Amino acid sequence: INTFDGVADYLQTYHKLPDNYITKSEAQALGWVASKGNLADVAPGKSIGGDIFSNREGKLPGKSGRTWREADINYTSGFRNSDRILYSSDWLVYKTTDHYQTFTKIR
């Protein structure tokens, strides 16, 4: 699962990212090097996902005790693209296709 809907539903049902996701340190550990656009080489079928998203600019709904996490959407190979899914500790789900410039609520 790596589509906006696919993931949004999985998160709604499972309360976690599907098996194809790994955090950046996890990828790092496997030999992922951001500069070389090699994710697909060191970890086929894997996408970067599950790291804490800051929300510095207040673009996402904030609240005490609420935390935001992100995951790469539609990634297949090469450098990372611009689609991301944003999920909260209380399960709101947002999307951006513009490298986090703007967001759209999807759940």
Domain ranges in the chain are 1-107
Q: Indicate if 26 belongs to the active site.
A: no
Of these residues, 15, 26, 57, 99, which one is catalytic? 99
Three-state DSSP state, 39:
helix
How many angstroms separate the CA atoms of 58 and 81, rounded?
23
Of these residues, 15, 26, 57, 70, which one is catalytic? 70
Tell me phi and psi for residue 10, to 5 degrees: -60, -45
Give the resolution in Å: 2.3
CA 32 to chain centre: 16
CB 10 within 8 A of CB 1: yes
- Structure tokens belonging to residue 43: 């970890």
Three-state DSSP state, 88:
strand
Q: Determination method here?
A: X-ray
How many angstroms separate the CA atoms of 90 and 82, rounded?
24
Q: Indicate if 57 belongs to the active site.
A: no
Q: How many CA atoms lie within 13 A of 70 on its CB side?
A: 18
CATH hierarchy code of domain 1-107 = 3.10.450.30
Q: How far is CA 28 from CA 25, 33, 35, 74, in A?
A: 5, 7, 12, 20
